[PDB]
Amino acid sequence: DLADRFAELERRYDARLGVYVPATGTTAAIEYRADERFAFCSTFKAPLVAAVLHQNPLTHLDKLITYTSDDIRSISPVAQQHVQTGMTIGQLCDAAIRYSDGTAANLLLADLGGPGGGTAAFTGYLRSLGDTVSRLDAEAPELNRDPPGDERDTTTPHAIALVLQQLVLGNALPPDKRALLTDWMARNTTGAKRIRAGFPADWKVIDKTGTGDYGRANDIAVVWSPTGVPYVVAVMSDRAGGGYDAEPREALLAEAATCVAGVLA
């Protein structure tokens, strides 16, 4: 009947909803449109930091990156205030996750290198994690603005959840790099009204949000129960029928998360 409740949320919010919660040692998977494609939007910035971590020693986090005001092409709460001084890779990782900083993400893509400003390299990192479906094609902000029919810049709830599972809970990263990613997600500033809002206060929530055109609103999270049992929760939504300027609905994500919390508690 949980599928019926998700379908009701879709009707109430005039939206398309995708959910994946991987199975665990003691719980079944939750899946709703889990193999349909949704735009990443800024959700890709969490695996992007993982990519950078993966291919460099941690001393690289101290590498100073310089850039100009002309590089501020997307919403960049941190980067736009440090044009004169530049930012370290570590600082860029922090900003990309906790403030969804677009310039920071673009500079991290460039740090991977190669064609498409690092977008091919990012896609390659997902392939290395066994993700045969996801792809990044554009930089910020263009990656948020593809038409609904376009497969560019898309993932699926199933794909991104299994990536995050490996990153935070698995051994895709060594413990030191894993702890950095986890902490940045744990101190995210953008996600209070999404998955966090759907779980009780005694659950811990770490997350990365995404928002875009056609009413896109996403959140990917790892949650810990009050006794410290972890789960991955991916929730994705759009309103392709509501125009490119359809309002994204944080409340839809919060309610979907409430329904998930009910299953997992």
UniProtKB/Swiss-Prot annotation:
List the residues marked with site Functions as a gatekeeper residue that regulates substrate accessibility to the enzyme active site.
I75
One of the entry's Gene Ontology molecular-function terms is: beta-lactamase activity
Kindly list the places in or outside the cell where this protein is found, as annotated in its UniProt entry: Cell inner membrane; Periplasm; Secreted
Site entry: Increases nucleophilicity of active site Ser: K45
Question: What reaction gets catalysed by this protein?
Answer: a beta-lactam + H2O = a substituted beta-amino acid
Gene Ontology BP term (one):
response to antibiotic
Quote the EC number.
3.5.2.6
Q: List keywords of the entry alphabetically.
A: Antibiotic resistance, Cell inner membrane, Cell membrane, Hydrolase, Membrane, Periplasm, Secreted, Signal
Biological role: Extended spectrum beta-lactamase (ESBL) that inactivates beta-lactam antibiotics by hydrolyzing the amide group of the beta-lactam ring. Displays high levels of penicillinase and cephalosporinase activity as well as measurable activity with carbapenems, including imipenem and meropenem. Plays a primary role in the intrinsic resistance of M.tuberculosis to beta-lactam antibiotics.
Family label: Belongs to the class-A beta-lactamase family.
Misc. comment:
The class A beta-lactamase family has a specific amino-acid numbering system, sometimes called Ambler or ABL numbering and often misspelt as Amber. A multiple sequence alignment was used to derive a consensus sequence and then the consensus was numbered taking into account insertions and deletions. This allows use of identical numbers, e.g. for active site residues, despite differences in protein length. UniProt always uses natural numbering of residues, hence there appear to be differences in numbering between this entry and some papers.
The name under which this protein is listed is Beta-lactamase
Native organism: Mycobacterium tuberculosis (strain ATCC 25618 / H37Rv)
- Tell me the name of the encoding gene: blaC
